[PDB]
Each structure stands twice: as structure tokens, then as C-alpha cells.
Design a protein around this nucleic acid. Sequence first.
RNA 1: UUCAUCUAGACAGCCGGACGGUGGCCAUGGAAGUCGGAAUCCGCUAAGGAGUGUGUAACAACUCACCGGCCGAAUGAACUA
RNA 2: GCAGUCAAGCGUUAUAGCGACAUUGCUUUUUGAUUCGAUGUCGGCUCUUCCUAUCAUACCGAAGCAGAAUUCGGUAAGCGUUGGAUACCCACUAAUAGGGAACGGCUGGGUUUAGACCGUCGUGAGACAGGUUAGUUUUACCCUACUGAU
Lengths: 504, 67, 150, 230
Amino acid sequence: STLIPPPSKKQKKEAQLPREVAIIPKDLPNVSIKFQALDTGDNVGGALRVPGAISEKQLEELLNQLNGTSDDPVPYTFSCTKTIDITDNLYSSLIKPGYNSTEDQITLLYTPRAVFKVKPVTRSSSAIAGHGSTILCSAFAPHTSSRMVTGAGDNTARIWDCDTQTPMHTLKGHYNWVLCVSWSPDGEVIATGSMDNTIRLWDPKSGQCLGDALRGHSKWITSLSWEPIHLVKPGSKPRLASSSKDGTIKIWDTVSRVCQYTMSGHTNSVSCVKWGGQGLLYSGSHDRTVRVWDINSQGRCINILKSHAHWVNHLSLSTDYALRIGAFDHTGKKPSTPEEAQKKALENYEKICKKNGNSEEMMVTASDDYTMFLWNPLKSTKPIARMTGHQKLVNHVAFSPDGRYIVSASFDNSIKLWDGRDGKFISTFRGHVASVYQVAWSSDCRLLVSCSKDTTLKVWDVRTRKLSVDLPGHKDEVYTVDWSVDGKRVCSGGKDKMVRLWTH
Amino acid sequence: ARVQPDRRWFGNTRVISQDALQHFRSALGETQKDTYQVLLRRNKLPMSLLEEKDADESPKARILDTE
Amino acid sequence: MQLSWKDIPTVAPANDLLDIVLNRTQRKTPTVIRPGFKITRIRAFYMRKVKYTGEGFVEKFEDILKGFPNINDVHPFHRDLMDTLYEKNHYKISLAAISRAKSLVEQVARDYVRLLKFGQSLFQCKQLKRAALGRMATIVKKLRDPLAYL
Amino acid sequence: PQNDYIERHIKQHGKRLDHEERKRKREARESHKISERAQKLTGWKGKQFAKKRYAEKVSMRKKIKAHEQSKVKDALPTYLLDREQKFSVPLPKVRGISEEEMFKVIKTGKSRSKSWKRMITKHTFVGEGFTRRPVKMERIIRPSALRQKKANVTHPELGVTVFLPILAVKKNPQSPMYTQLGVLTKGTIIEVNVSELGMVTAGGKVVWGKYAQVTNEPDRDGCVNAVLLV
RNA sequence: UUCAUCUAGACAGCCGGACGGUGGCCAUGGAAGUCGGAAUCCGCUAAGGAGUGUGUAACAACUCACCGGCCGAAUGAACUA
RNA sequence: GCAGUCAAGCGUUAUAGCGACAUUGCUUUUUGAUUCGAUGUCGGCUCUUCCUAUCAUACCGAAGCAGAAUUCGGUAAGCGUUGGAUACCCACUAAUAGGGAACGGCUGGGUUUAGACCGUCGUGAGACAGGUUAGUUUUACCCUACUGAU
Ligand SMILES: [Mg+2]
Ligand SMILES: [Mg+2]
């Protein structure tokens, strides 16, 4: 094993020398600061003088008292413009490095954060067997973290109980490889789209198949999306959109188990379909185009976006986490009535959708031309930004659950972090020695997990922009990874025919 | 000329840890070269892993794949 | 301006170009060498084979490269017309493939002449010459589609 | 003339009056002409003609088989489909090479009376930081044109060949003297850099050095080919 | 040498038929079997490909895949020496 | 070259093993950009003939071959294939093709012995990793062959 060079004799003498102590001064003068929001740029109080030894919690309470919301405070983070975040106190964060003097003002930008915290996963809970072939897709239940669905190449899916790390149900309806699995946003039905151009619906509690399979596609299913709960009328079940290799997006109403619309504008294989929160659908396909359809206009193609020089491999939405989670939260609370479920889903969607004046739903498309494009398809037809820097194709892309960051996993053994609003480049996550297949965020937007061809997972801290923990254990390539809604478990699977569950 | 069967031929000869990779990656870039220092011996390192530089632009897409 | 580009010599495909160059080497260079001759004579024989084949490939590639117009350097009207007719991207990519193949052939020729300087037997010199010609042939066979397009 | 002027001329004036009959008669004579060429062509042209005839017949039989087959009638993820690509060594015994073949006698002096210098005729690996010794003390000579730094290493799993740098010469089967001189012949065990292969151990360590065995004669073919020992 | 065809018709030749839904769907300035991409079905037949090639800007026209009429006795293919 | 794939065959009643034609990966990536150790035999002058694996000249075939020009190919050795500068350039030219009878008479570099100097090594006599300069071998009237002559 190759080791870093040892310290020299002079360095050992310097180590044996006594150390300085970073203590807070007592005669520290008052500092003038100006509050400003990151999303809106609104100034609170103008220039206010605070003690130089102000702590982050006391500054948060001061901001809450300025806003008039001390009764129900919301935890925020602070940054200062080179932008430096506030770790412990103002003196150590800014004054101790000496970048800003006491006489000069300090412009503090505040950004809301999550009340809860997710601890990083540091070990494997279990390595569960059962599948006969390579594992292709995995997903967690939205309501609970104890249910995981995994579809593999042995023409089967499996429902695993995450509390005991044991298999619970086996789904054996399909005839060919189960390419994609998905859970309903209300947690009622699991949809499996397979290699044999079919889709099957399953009740997970009984582990049973609901009627016959959905048929009509001529080639294998590529992606599945569900209608958002906040758009579904109460008392109704969400519809299922499916993309496939044949170039068509089919919409299925599961109440009558029929097909309503068959969008057919693409001339090549549709890579992915996503059902947004404003009654629109976005499809990325191998004909270098992204098609924007309207569900309210008989499935007509509203727009065609053409800016890529190769296949668009993946797309993501700003509110994608909210659309996937539906009405549930990180605490696993279940609404009593469909009306309450619809209202809670609407609030969860709006908290990400409507901000900084007008409600916007940004989209990001990652393609085989080594690049990504950031769009705002509602207001404009041109792309808002172009993200470049990857030396190989960008296989996966994901918005943060708060919609403030974009993470792109490419085939050049790298991940890249970009701003979620204007698409400016932030940082590079390095450490994988093979191509990164896919990525996943944590619930509080502070941790990231990625699976790679080098048989390893990696957990990264977004704030410090560095690797947190490397997770080996898989015997071969890891194809699918997911993080639970409560941020307690991580599931992974690949060519070793084993489901790896990881916990803190 | 014969080679005897041995399990030493099939073992790993050189490995590097993630912490060592990060240390050398951060050190490569912070070096301040002195004109009066000469290179007496080069350290043996996986330079293909350690030499990763952020690039502002990506190369052009290969058009022969699609057309 | 040139205004006309008819005087471009015929571009043979990959297999036909290989036949032309290799059979030109076999015809125009001496073919009888004996194992009882001096090692210097044997080395010179096989060096001449490698160098002549490399020169033939290089001059064919140069005749291709000089003949075709420069799409960016012509008048913008002609540039737009040729872009509409022949897809300027494919045009430049094919010509760059020709240029890169020329460079690779030159490098193979130089390297194998240098290696043939240290041959110890007729068998070894023959193997080195066959290796040089086979690598040149692989380089040329990789140009099947750009040559037909051109 | 401009554009497709010959096709326009054929459209507006036709062809020669005996064109169709002459072409039909030539295509009818083609079988006799092929047989006469096969029986008359001599030497290299005859050999090439026979080779091309064999290739054409094989292609025709494959086409007929494909038509008849047509008339009779890895478990990859979504993002990877529609995309394409004992402890015994593979060469436990190789041909022995004597010192007479390995070394070449170099003579020095005006009358060439001294014969103590020896030149290595095979390809060598000299490592990093190599400086030639002074000529008065240089007995063993490794010429620069025969020095190698990289090799084409083939991985048995996944079936890929990569151009990898050479790290060390572990064992030359002929002699430990050749091992310490760095001679690269067939059957030699070398150490190669495998950083680009992305191998990770069970403990999370990145593998960047492994062993390979040379499978060819670089002095014969101008390059080093090796198989990775996995 | 082994498979096949054959006076309820052997190989060549000549003549006739070679249809209808239909200009099948998408695409194209135009594309009707014959620039392309995926289906490649049904009916009536003795038989007739959602077409083997020539040909048209597209059609048209010819052709052969196949069937029939005349002719009347052996013939074809693959291997071996 | 190495490693692999397919299968017309070969082998067999144990879907073992050989295996033509094809094909992939490395060498080698995309916008026509921008000299690296020959350890021992080389070159001229004059002049003849031979090979064809044909550069030119003669006659043909094919090609988006309009004309002009050019490319590939066929028969073909009758006839030619240069002048210079220091292996590469310049020019003329129809063209400046390759090779054998040595490399299984004059003449320069080389086997150059005795003189001399510089460098490296050696305690030295001396040797060489080497570099420079100066340095006598002189038939024919014999037989045949060839050219002419009785
Ligand atoms: Mg000839
Ligand atoms: Mg002397």
C-alpha cells in the first residue's frame, strides 16, 4: 500500500512546540451586518450592529425576531460574500481569517434549511439473497422506510422488509427482465414495467397482481411516472405514464385499467418520461429532442426543445422529490381523508414550486453530448443555461429536494455539483475509479449517495463538498441505489444478485 | 525457462487508499516550484488517478454515432 | 478565387488503395534476398521495403488532402453551398481522419526502420517488415467510410 | 457542363444504338471469361484471383443461408442497453534463449582487438531515472531504440486490451541475470499500472499495480503484448 | 456417392396469366412493390412478394417469384476420386 | 502481434477438441491541426550485356471518362531513362523505373606496419570510448578469348 510521506524532523519539532488556542476576544467591537435572502434578495433591517461574538443560534433568533416569527422559528444557514458559510460564530468564520475588518459591513445571505437531520450511512445492515439474476431497479416505499421493491433480470420483483432485512413478497408475473419499478405516491400500488413490453400493478400488502398486465407497447418499457397527488382529484387514483423503446408515451387509467392517450411525436427511443406538477409531461428521447406535452389538451405536444447534439439520457425536475413523495413527509404521517391528502400534497408541492415571486418549475436534461441543459419550459423555449465540463456522457442527473442544487453523475468517473437556479458550476465530487451509474439525495439536501461500476457506493457531504464515507462490499457492479424518505436506510443492488441494505 | 505455479503472481502488488488519494490530489496543485531545487528521485504514484483538473468546457460530441 | 474543383484525383477505397500501394511496393522494389547474404544487406532490403510502402501511403494521402478545398478558407457563399451539399462537419472529419492516418503511417515507418537497424537474422528482419506493413494496412483499413464519402 | 450532365444527355439523346445488345453479350461472355482467367492467370495475379473467387463464393453462400433463415421464419439496466462494449501462469514453459543469442559481441580498438562489450539484442525495461554509465565502464549495452515503457495488456474478464505503463520486471524465466537486466522476452512476468481499469479490493483500496505475463516476442513484432494475471 | 423432380408431364424454349382491399402506415417538394424506417396482413385463386430487378420527377411499361398452355423423356443439386 | 467472437468444413453419439473466409479491442481520435547506439566493409571513372517486377514512348480495357487533363489496369524490354549542389534538394526532360552478372583496368574511403600530438584507462611497460596528421609494391614477349591482317 502506498503511503503519504512521513513528517520531517523540523515538522516534528514544530508539532512538539506549544499550540495556539483560538479563544473568543472579550473586547470585540460591534459589527454592522445587512441581512439578505438568497432566493429573493430582500433586505431586513438595513445595517444592524451585533456583538462580534454572535453565535449562529443567537443570530438565527435575531433574524426570527426581526421577521416577527419568534413563536415558530425555522432553522436557517448564513453565507457571506468568495462566499463563506457561517460555521460556529461570526468572529471565527470571517473576522479570524481577517478577510473583512470590523469597520466594514458584512452582507449575510440567509437560506432556509430542514428542521430534521439525516445521519450518514456508515455500514451495511445486511446482504440479502433471493434473486436469481442481476438486480436492475430498486425503490423505497414513500410512506415507510421498511418496504423496498426490487426488480431484477430473473423476470421477478421482490418486496423486502427493511426492519428485519428479510424478503416479504415475490412478484412473478412478467416473462422477461423487469426493467423499471415504481411505487404509487399514495403508497397503494407498485408498478413494474418489464422487458416484454408490459406493465403490471401489484398490491404490496398481499403481494398480489391486480388483474391483467397493461399491454399496447411494442418494445420494452424505459421509464414510469405517476400523476401527482395534488393534481389528482380526491376519491380518484393517480394515472400512470410509461415510456418505451418504441418511441411512444402511453397513459393508463388504473381505475378502469385502460389506456387513454398514446403520445407518438418522438422518432426514436424515449429515454425518460416525467409527470410534472402543473399538468405537463416531459419526455427525453434518443432523437436529441425533449417534448413537452399537456395532459389537459388530449395529450398534445405543446413544445419541442432541441438543443442537444446527442441522445438525452436523463431529465429531472425541481419539484421531482415532492412529486415522488406525494402527501407523505419524513415523519411517515398518513392523512386520514383524501381531501386532507390532496391539501397536504398541494402544500408540499407549493413549498418548492412557488417562491421568489412567481411559481417556477425548472428542468435539467443530461445527454450523451457530455453536457446538460437547464430549462424553464413554462416561460421560455430557449434553454436557460448550459452545463459543460464532463469529459464523457452524463448518465444521471438529480435536483436537490429543496431544488437549490443539481448533481450530475457521468461516465468520466465523476460527479458534478451545480447551482439549481442559474446552473453555474460549483464543485466536482471525485473518488470513483469507474463510471458513476446513478445518484440519490438525502431528505435534508445535505448528503449525497452514488453507486459506481467500481463495485462501491460513496456518501458525500454537500456543504463541505468532499467525500464523507466510502462503502465497499458488493462483489460486482452496482446498478441501482436509493435512499429512504426518513433518511434511515440506503438500498443498493447490482450484478452480485444481492440486495445491500446500509444504515447509520 | 519455466515459471512455477504460485499465488503471488495473482495478488495485488500496489494499492492506494482513498485518504492517500485525496492527500496527493490536494498536494498536486499546492506545489510551489523552486528554481534552485532539483529532482533527485521521483515518487511512484498513480498519476492517471491523481491528475484530474476541472475543465470549463466539454469536447464536441461525436456526430458519427447519430449520422 | 479558384471557383472550380474538378482537378481532384480519384480517391480509391480502402481495399483498392491497399492493393495499389502494396503491389507497387512488390513490383517496384527488388524481391529476392538470400539468408546467406550479409546482415547489412538483409537489413537494407527490409528497410527499403518499409520506407517505400510508407512513402506510397503518405503520397496518396497528400494527394487526397491537397486536392480538396478548404471549407473555412473559401468565399462564404461557396462555404455555405458546400455545407448544404456535403455537411461541412462530415467533410472536415473525413479529411482530418485522412491527415491522422498519414501521421500514423509516418510514425510506424520511422519506428520500424529504427527497429530494423538492430535485426540479427533474415527471419527477424522479415517479421519486423511484415509487422510494419500489417500495421500500415490496419491503419488504412480503418479508413473505409471516409474514403467512400470523399 | 453542370450538375448531372451525362444523365441529362442520356435522358435527352439516349445511348448508342447497340448499347443494350453489346452489354448483354458481354455479360453472357463473362462466364467463359472467368473460366479462362482462372486457367490462364499465372503467379501472384492467379493466386489473388483464386483468393477473391473463394471469398466471393463464401459471401454468396452466406447470403443464401441468410435468405433461407429469414424465409423460414446479460440482464443490463435501462441506461446500459442500446450500448455495446490452480495458480498456474498461461505460459508455464517457453523457448530457452542462450547467451549467444541474447548478447552481441561489440569490438573496440583501432584494430578491433578487444571484445569485452556486450549488446543486448532483445527489448528491455530500464525503469525510471536511468542514466547511461560512462562508455569506458559500460560493459552491458541496452540501446535506446530497444527500450520499452508501455505494453498492450489483455484482461481475461470483460475481454479488453489496454495500453498500460510498465512498472517493473518481476521475473524473466530464462535467468535472474536477465531479470535484473530488465529483459522483455516471451514468458516474462512484469508489473503494470492498472489504474484505468478501476479495480477495488474488498477493503476499499484502489488497485493500481498488478502482474502480467508477456505472451509475444517483442524483438520479432516490435511491441509488447501481455496477459493480466487474475 | 447421396439426395431430389418426373406421361394425374423431366430440363430448356415460346406464349399467356401475374389479381383485389391498396396509392397498407410513417416520412417526403415529389416516393403509387422497387430513395428510406418499422409492419409485413386479409381475400380470390391454378398462382401471384404489402415485391426480384430495369425503369419514372412521381405514374406508366417490362421483368421474375409463382401458375397455366404447346412441346414429349429423362433431369437437377451437393459431394468424392 | 497478442487476446477474443462467428462458423463452411473436420471430428463424434461423450453440444470434447482442430478449424477456412470473415470480425472486434490495444497500438490510434475525431473538424484536414501542428532526428535516440547499423561494431564491420563503402563509393567513384570507363564500358558491355541480361531480367521485367514498365518510368517514358506503341496499342488496348475500366472509371461522373463533356473537352483538356488525370487515376487504376492489360499486352509489351523494340527504344530511351539526364545535368548539377551538399542520402536529401535544384533544374531540364517524353521519362529522369527497379534490379542482376561483385557484394552467398585506374581510383578515393578502408586492413593503411615503423614517426608524431590530444583525450580515457593503467603504479608502469602499455592498452583503448576515442580524435588529428604523414606514410615505395613495379607482368605480359606465354596460352586462350576478342579486334583487325596474311
Ligand atoms: Mg509484364
Ligand atoms: Mg601507425
